[PDB]
Design a protein around this ligand. Structure first.
Ligand SMILES: CCS(=O)(=O)Nc1cccc(-c2cn(C)c(=O)c3ccccc23)c1
Length: 126
């Protein structure tokens, strides 16, 4: 079994910007979610090999995780905050698509998403 390459976190051709919203997303939002008791399964790409999930990447074709988001924020990959917010949303949605309602991982994702949405209500004006 093999995992796919992770999502891109570096691309010298992609224009980059360091907006106050992106700074908030790193310094406040990501940092707070990262320490949550349920964050650990989301801190790196799903390792379908290690977890014996051979169908994971047959079903999930747009993978995303908080480790990738952290690298994108820390390595100035984004142009705007919406790109980052979309990455979080992709992470959560993938979990809800792949797993059954009521699976522990889904409950963990839902708790993180509730927190994420509350925090982004305080995103500063651009
Ligand atoms: C740090 C990423 S890991 O892959 O190295 N470890 C890890 C450990 C426990 C749980 C999962 C996990 C994560 N997600 C997002 C899932 O959807 C999922 C679905 C079924 C079974 C396990 C998981 C991954």
């Amino acid at each position: 079994s093999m995992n796919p390459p992770p999502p891109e976190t570096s691309n010298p051709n992609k224009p980059k910007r360091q907006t106050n919203q992106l700074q908030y997303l790193l310094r406040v939002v990501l940092k707070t979610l990262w320490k949550h008791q349920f964050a650990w399964p989301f801190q790196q790409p799903v390792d379908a090999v290690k977890l014996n999930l051979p169908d994971y990447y047959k079903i999930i074709k747009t993978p995303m995780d908080m480790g990738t988001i952290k690298k994108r924020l820390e390595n100035n990959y984004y142009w705007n905050a919406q790109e980052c917010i979309q990455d979080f949303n992709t992470m959560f949605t993938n979990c809800y698509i792949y797993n059954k309602p009521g699976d522990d991982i889904v409950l963990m994702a839902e708790a993180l998403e509730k927190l994420f949405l509350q925090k982004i209500n305080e995103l500063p004006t651009e």
